[PDB]
Design an enzyme around this catalytic site. Sequence first.
Site, short mmCIF file in Angstrom:
data_model
loop_
_atom_site.label_atom_id
_atom_site.label_comp_id
_atom_site.label_asym_id
_atom_site.label_seq_id
_atom_site.Cartn_x
_atom_site.Cartn_y
_atom_site.Cartn_z
N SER A 147 24.54 -13.64 58.36
CA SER A 147 24.79 -12.23 58.37
C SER A 147 24.79 -11.43 57.06
CB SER A 147 26.30 -12.21 58.97
OG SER A 147 26.78 -10.75 59.23
N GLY A 148 23.78 -10.51 56.89
CA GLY A 148 23.69 -9.80 55.67
C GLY A 148 22.34 -10.30 54.98
N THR A 152 16.92 -8.00 59.84
CA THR A 152 16.63 -6.64 60.56
C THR A 152 15.81 -5.57 59.53
OG1 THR A 152 18.77 -6.74 62.08
CG2 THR A 152 17.85 -4.45 61.25
N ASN A 195 28.43 -7.37 56.65
CA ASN A 195 27.38 -6.60 56.72
C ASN A 195 27.90 -5.09 57.33
OD1 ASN A 195 24.81 -4.92 57.28
ND2 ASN A 195 23.99 -6.97 58.33
N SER A 198 25.82 -4.92 60.72
CA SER A 198 25.75 -5.87 61.54
C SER A 198 25.10 -5.83 62.96
CB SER A 198 26.92 -6.70 61.50
OG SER A 198 26.78 -7.97 62.05
N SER A 199 24.08 -6.44 63.30
CA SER A 199 23.26 -6.85 64.66
C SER A 199 24.35 -7.49 65.44
CB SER A 199 22.00 -7.15 64.25
OG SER A 199 21.04 -6.64 63.37
N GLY A 421 21.90 -16.30 62.26
CA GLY A 421 21.81 -17.76 62.11
C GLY A 421 23.06 -18.48 62.34
N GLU A 423 26.33 -20.04 61.75
CA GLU A 423 27.55 -19.67 60.59
C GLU A 423 28.87 -20.31 61.41
OE1 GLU A 423 27.34 -15.72 58.36
OE2 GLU A 423 26.19 -15.11 60.10
N1 LIG Z 1 14.37 -5.53 51.35
C1 LIG Z 1 15.46 -4.90 51.42
N2 LIG Z 1 15.67 -3.79 50.44
C2 LIG Z 1 16.76 -2.93 50.65
N3 LIG Z 1 18.02 -3.13 51.20
C3 LIG Z 1 18.12 -4.35 51.65
C4 LIG Z 1 16.81 -5.29 51.97
N4 LIG Z 1 17.37 -6.08 52.84
C5 LIG Z 1 18.58 -5.97 53.19
N5 LIG Z 1 19.14 -4.76 52.42
C6 LIG Z 1 20.44 -4.61 52.75
O1 LIG Z 1 21.19 -5.45 53.06
C7 LIG Z 1 21.73 -4.76 54.51
C8 LIG Z 1 22.04 -6.02 55.35
O2 LIG Z 1 20.81 -6.27 55.89
P1 LIG Z 1 20.29 -6.81 57.47
O3 LIG Z 1 18.81 -6.76 57.57
O4 LIG Z 1 21.02 -5.71 58.32
O5 LIG Z 1 20.98 -8.07 57.65
P2 LIG Z 1 20.82 -9.02 58.95
O6 LIG Z 1 20.23 -10.38 58.42
O7 LIG Z 1 22.46 -9.53 59.28
O8 LIG Z 1 20.08 -8.39 60.00
C9 LIG Z 1 21.12 -3.99 54.68
O9 LIG Z 1 22.04 -2.78 55.42
C10 LIG Z 1 20.59 -3.22 53.57
O10 LIG Z 1 21.32 -2.30 52.96
MG LIG Z 2 20.47 -7.55 61.75
#
Ligand SMILES: Nc1ncnc2c1ncn2[C@@H]1O[C@H](COP(=O)(O)OP(=O)(O)O)[C@@H](O)[C@H]1O
Ligand SMILES: [Mg+2]
Length: 707
Positions: A147-148, A152, A195, A198-199, A421, A423
Amino acid sequence: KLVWVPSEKHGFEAASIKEEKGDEVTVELQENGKKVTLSKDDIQKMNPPKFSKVEDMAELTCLNEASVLHNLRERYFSGLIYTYSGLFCVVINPYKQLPIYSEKIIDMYKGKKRHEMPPHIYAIADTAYRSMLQDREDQSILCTGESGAGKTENTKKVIQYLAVVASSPYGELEKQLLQANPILEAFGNAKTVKNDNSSRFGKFIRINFDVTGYIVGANIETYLLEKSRAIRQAKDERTFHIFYYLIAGASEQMRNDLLLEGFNNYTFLSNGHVPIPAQQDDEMFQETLEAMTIMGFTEEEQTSILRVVSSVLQLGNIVFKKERNTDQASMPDNTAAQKVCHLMGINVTDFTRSILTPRIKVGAAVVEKAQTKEQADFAIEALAKAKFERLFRWILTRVNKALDKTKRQGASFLGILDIAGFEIFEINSFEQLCINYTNEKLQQLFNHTMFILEQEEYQREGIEWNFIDFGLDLQPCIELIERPTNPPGVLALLDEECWFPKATDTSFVEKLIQEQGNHAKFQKSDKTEFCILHYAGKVTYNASAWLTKNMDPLNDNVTSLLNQSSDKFVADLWKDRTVGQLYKEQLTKLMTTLRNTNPNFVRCIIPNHEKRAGKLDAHLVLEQLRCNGVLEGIRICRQGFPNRIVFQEFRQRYEILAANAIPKGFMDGKQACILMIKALELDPNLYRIGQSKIFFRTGVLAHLEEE
Ligand SMILES: Nc1ncnc2c1ncn2[C@@H]1O[C@H](COP(=O)(O)OP(=O)(O)O)[C@@H](O)[C@H]1O
Ligand SMILES: [Mg+2]
Ligand SMILES: CN(C(=O)NCc1cccc(F)c1Cl)[C@H](COC(=O)Nc1cc2ccccc2cn1)C[C@@H](O)CO
């Protein structure tokens, strides 16, 4: 004379050797002069400074966990989040915006070979795309992590990249594709401790193409919606976004139409209004209406959706008391029930009778028993959960209908996978069993893929492949969960305990211990608890309420009223065996899709547990490289030939330290190398000659950068 040593602070740390003594070594920490005595076994060789921030770590001439960590850490602090590591990619969430996702940069990766550019998500997407055309095969990109970690965000970059380079300013279908996730996230995401976006569902996005490579359509599947978040949330956390968007952003007109009533007025909003930093819910409401409008949702459709969101909150405001000295539920206040029936399009007195005095068909007559307060509460809660899950599935179907509108199924597809993943939590329940089960399947596909890629490389060169399939380790644990009979697995036992008249949760845990008590991956742990040894760790499960969760019972009376709602939309929602059975089928079909593609793995890494930019937590990163298999990878290539180099390349690099081996004049490349090797007096156990390359142990090639 610098070396890597273990550090409790930094994970690994630079040190200079100062003294030896058999298996003992005394070292001087390069940071604070401090003296440290270690086993020679704890020392890790350091790579030469010419590999600083190397873009593909397969190029490292010393493969070890310390050297890997250092390289990832070095690139990260220079704002370089992407690194290649041979057969897969690694990404460390920057927690800040980077100038690396522009339209210019998209065009720079168009057509490029992975190694002709700096590592980027764009290059994984482009290479997967060319292979689709060139080989006429379907492709997948898998984004994995805690998570985080950033799954996504990387998923969305692959969509926006493809919608640009494979378009046929965008065009209608690509405009709608880029709107799908903004819609789905409003209804499926929530603010969580780890997060802020969070999805709470897993998703797999299929993009469909021509023979020519033009996007023709798309389809989305979702997995494991966290239904129960709609009812209650833990400390500091929010429900799904849409509830805060609507309440904070409704016009005065809408506020009236949908009987809305503000943040502190809803039992289902446990912590009332809690803010998401750098987002306002009213502005977000606007982005979400706009996205639904670009997608083709009629105004009446948008309003019907919001009417359902509102009714889910109203169900939560109903209170049952008991009759004096009985357990029978009573509804003294009538108001909540009236508002919700208004929104749901049914009859409040039929609704009441249904909840309190259900007619039950039972063969020899129809039993009409009165319900306890506990029973009416559970029924209302089951209904709000079911109501919202159905709403998400409806929004998903209509997103899909707008995206598969052309009825063309194309020649090929490229699937993008975005699933939670492994956890381990304080409490691990049925939903965690399913997530952890899914990651056994996914990690196995990874070990297997690496296995097939290696085996083919060895086959085309001669050498000498004596490992059994890497994915076979995960099979016993998988079998403990998903095996039908012989010994039945956890799921099958659950399904059987459910057709048992006087079964309890603990009854189920006891039968489990009976049949799997001595299974290699089982362990007895409290009377509803048990353990399972997963790929990445021992997990303690608590089986409380699993019997109910597997069955997912609803009140069939009120369900029937909603099936005949006077509102056409609510009617549609309710237009119509175990939860375990169904999920296993969903996962079987997903794995089948994936096994029939060429997969690309994107390993997402979270830098710290504080949402901080520019701070890397060494042990947190190391633990994540352990769950991923990255560290099993280092161990396994350590027991092999990690360095492999083409004849022509070996010539024009080390003819320096070996000039006199090769006589003047043309010569076959393998021939020249054989001479260079004899001229090195190299021990024959440390290399192998292949059809086009030399296979070197680690770090035989390191030894030559000097001596
Ligand atoms: N490549 C990136 N550039 C900028 N911010 C990022 C990037 N990847 C993640 N983040 C930040 O981290 C947060 C969590 O990422 P996310 O993809 O939502 O997590 P998860 O793996 O749980 O889907 C996002 O809301 C964003 O703020
Ligand atoms: Mg996600
Ligand atoms: C030698 N190698 C590298 O890429 N080495 C760097 C490296 C490996 C592992 C983790 C890491 F961090 C890093 Cl830098 C390429 C192929 O070797 C593999 O990748 N197998 C492999 C097997 C695994 C088995 C189980 C679990 C994970 C696994 C991962 N991976 C082949 C190269 O010659 C060409 O690029």
